Design an enzyme around this catalytic site. Structure first.
Site, PDB file in Angstrom:
ATOM      1  N   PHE A  36      89.103  21.957  32.166  1.00  0.00           N
ATOM      2  CA  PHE A  36      88.087  23.015  32.126  1.00  0.00           C
ATOM      3  C   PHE A  36      86.696  22.406  32.335  1.00  0.00           C
ATOM      4  O   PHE A  36      86.276  21.536  31.567  1.00  0.00           O
ATOM      5  CB  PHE A  36      88.195  23.703  30.754  1.00  0.00           C
ATOM      6  CG  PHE A  36      87.477  25.042  30.640  1.00  0.00           C
ATOM      7  CD1 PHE A  36      87.458  25.946  31.687  1.00  0.00           C
ATOM      8  CD2 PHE A  36      86.886  25.406  29.434  1.00  0.00           C
ATOM      9  CE1 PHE A  36      86.817  27.185  31.548  1.00  0.00           C
ATOM     10  CE2 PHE A  36      86.249  26.630  29.279  1.00  0.00           C
ATOM     11  CZ  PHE A  36      86.209  27.529  30.347  1.00  0.00           C
ATOM     12  N   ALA A  37      85.992  22.839  33.382  1.00  0.00           N
ATOM     13  CA  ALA A  37      84.666  22.297  33.686  1.00  0.00           C
ATOM     14  C   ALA A  37      83.653  22.674  32.610  1.00  0.00           C
ATOM     15  O   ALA A  37      83.734  23.755  32.036  1.00  0.00           O
ATOM     16  CB  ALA A  37      84.175  22.798  35.037  1.00  0.00           C
ATOM     17  N   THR A  38      82.677  21.805  32.375  1.00  0.00           N
ATOM     18  CA  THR A  38      81.618  22.122  31.437  1.00  0.00           C
ATOM     19  C   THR A  38      80.888  23.374  31.931  1.00  0.00           C
ATOM     20  O   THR A  38      80.530  24.244  31.153  1.00  0.00           O
ATOM     21  CB  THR A  38      80.602  20.966  31.292  1.00  0.00           C
ATOM     22  OG1 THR A  38      81.277  19.768  30.861  1.00  0.00           O
ATOM     23  CG2 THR A  38      79.509  21.335  30.280  1.00  0.00           C
ATOM     24  N   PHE A  40      82.050  25.885  33.540  1.00  0.00           N
ATOM     25  CA  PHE A  40      82.862  27.054  33.236  1.00  0.00           C
ATOM     26  C   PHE A  40      82.837  27.364  31.729  1.00  0.00           C
ATOM     27  O   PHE A  40      82.845  28.534  31.322  1.00  0.00           O
ATOM     28  CB  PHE A  40      84.302  26.878  33.720  1.00  0.00           C
ATOM     29  CG  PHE A  40      84.491  27.122  35.201  1.00  0.00           C
ATOM     30  CD1 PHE A  40      83.989  28.267  35.807  1.00  0.00           C
ATOM     31  CD2 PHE A  40      85.198  26.215  35.978  1.00  0.00           C
ATOM     32  CE1 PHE A  40      84.165  28.493  37.162  1.00  0.00           C
ATOM     33  CE2 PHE A  40      85.390  26.433  37.336  1.00  0.00           C
ATOM     34  CZ  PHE A  40      84.870  27.577  37.932  1.00  0.00           C
ATOM     35  N   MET A  45      80.719  30.864  27.367  1.00  0.00           N
ATOM     36  CA  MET A  45      79.813  31.009  26.227  1.00  0.00           C
ATOM     37  C   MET A  45      78.766  32.085  26.516  1.00  0.00           C
ATOM     38  O   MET A  45      78.516  32.962  25.691  1.00  0.00           O
ATOM     39  CB  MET A  45      79.130  29.671  25.923  1.00  0.00           C
ATOM     40  CG  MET A  45      80.032  28.629  25.251  1.00  0.00           C
ATOM     41  SD  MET A  45      79.254  27.002  25.242  1.00  0.00           S
ATOM     42  CE  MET A  45      80.282  26.122  24.050  1.00  0.00           C
ATOM     43  N   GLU A  46      78.144  32.007  27.685  1.00  0.00           N
ATOM     44  CA  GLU A  46      77.170  33.031  28.085  1.00  0.00           C
ATOM     45  C   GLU A  46      77.803  34.417  28.096  1.00  0.00           C
ATOM     46  O   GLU A  46      77.212  35.384  27.625  1.00  0.00           O
ATOM     47  CB  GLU A  46      76.612  32.752  29.477  1.00  0.00           C
ATOM     48  CG  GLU A  46      75.629  31.606  29.583  1.00  0.00           C
ATOM     49  CD  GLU A  46      74.888  31.630  30.919  1.00  0.00           C
ATOM     50  OE1 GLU A  46      74.439  32.719  31.344  1.00  0.00           O
ATOM     51  OE2 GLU A  46      74.732  30.565  31.537  1.00  0.00           O
ATOM     52  N   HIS A  72      80.313  18.775  24.723  1.00  0.00           N
ATOM     53  CA  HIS A  72      81.627  19.063  25.239  1.00  0.00           C
ATOM     54  C   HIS A  72      82.490  17.902  24.831  1.00  0.00           C
ATOM     55  O   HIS A  72      82.458  16.930  25.445  1.00  0.00           O
ATOM     56  CB  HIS A  72      81.577  19.202  26.768  1.00  0.00           C
ATOM     57  CG  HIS A  72      82.734  19.939  27.352  1.00  0.00           C
ATOM     58  ND1 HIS A  72      82.808  20.303  28.671  1.00  0.00           N
ATOM     59  CD2 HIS A  72      83.855  20.409  26.774  1.00  0.00           C
ATOM     60  CE1 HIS A  72      83.939  20.935  28.882  1.00  0.00           C
ATOM     61  NE2 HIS A  72      84.592  21.011  27.748  1.00  0.00           N
ATOM     62  N   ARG A 116      68.756  33.611  25.570  1.00  0.00           N
ATOM     63  CA  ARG A 116      68.702  34.617  26.610  1.00  0.00           C
ATOM     64  C   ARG A 116      67.411  35.400  26.482  1.00  0.00           C
ATOM     65  O   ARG A 116      66.804  35.447  25.410  1.00  0.00           O
ATOM     66  CB  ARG A 116      69.920  35.550  26.535  1.00  0.00           C
ATOM     67  CG  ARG A 116      71.264  34.814  26.711  1.00  0.00           C
ATOM     68  CD  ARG A 116      72.434  35.767  26.878  1.00  0.00           C
ATOM     69  NE  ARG A 116      72.382  36.447  28.169  1.00  0.00           N
ATOM     70  CZ  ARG A 116      72.811  35.917  29.311  1.00  0.00           C
ATOM     71  NH1 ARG A 116      73.348  34.698  29.318  1.00  0.00           N
ATOM     72  NH2 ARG A 116      72.717  36.605  30.441  1.00  0.00           N
TER      73      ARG A 116
END
EC number: 3.1.2.29
Lengths: 133, 133
Positions: A36-38, A40, A45-46, A72, A116
């Protein structure tokens, strides 16, 4: 929204959520382990925070991610469920801060903070249209 | 070497916008057509990875273990995002970076990134232990 409020979002990692899939354009990434890519993880999370905020947005409003600060710490192969927990930590103006964490059922895989800003889409859309080549 | 500025240029295509990060996400699918924070993180990792590759030993790779960055301006497809990665330190297997990114119009973010040198097969095996049958 209420400071302290939590939201949870579960995601079974598919095969197209690994490092090489975030940037097929990258030869430098074709060598990477199928995890799993950081980027992604950051997206998931977003996504959790977005879903948490949605009920409280006036018509015509959206939000942008303005900061991400995470570790991570463990790697996740396709097949595991990643659970993101998002906890609202503070609000100030159009700004919200969340403590985010992620666990893949086996290990805690990372955690940190995400900020955000609520925006008015069509003013923002106009701005992004004037930066467009 | 420490203090060395590595540059990485990337023309943003349509398929690096928010909806493309998670086509699974209905929430993302209506977002403005701007370069996703998750793709910016991947691009920053890419810059650091390229900057390292000469310096790894055979069978070595790396993983990002932390990212802490702002995302302060939006980027439509067509602009070139330039990442500047500067090495802060090398301590054992840990390589620490200051990164920033600019789209030819605005600075779009900056902060820090850490990576860990790994033995590729030694790591791939560890991941197998977590891989569901």
């Amino acid at each position: 929204m209420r400071v302290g409020e939590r939201f949870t979002h579960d995601f079974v990692v598919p095969p197209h959520k690994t490092v090489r899939h975030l940037y097929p354009e990258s030869p430098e990434f074709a060598e990477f382990p199928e995890v799993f890519a950081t980027g992604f993880m950051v997206g998931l999370m977003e996504w959790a925070c977005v879903r948490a905020m949605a009920p409280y947005l006036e018509p015509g409003e959206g939000s942008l991610g303005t900061a991400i600060c995470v570790t991570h710490t463990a790697a996740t192969p396709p097949g595991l469920t990643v659970t993101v927990t998002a906890e609202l930590r503070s609000v100030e103006g159009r700004r919200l801060s969340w403590r985010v964490s992620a666990h893949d059922g086996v290990d805690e895989i990372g955690s940190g903070t995400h900020e955000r800003a609520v925006i008015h889409l069509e003013k923002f859309n106009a701005k992004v249209r004037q930066k467009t080549p």
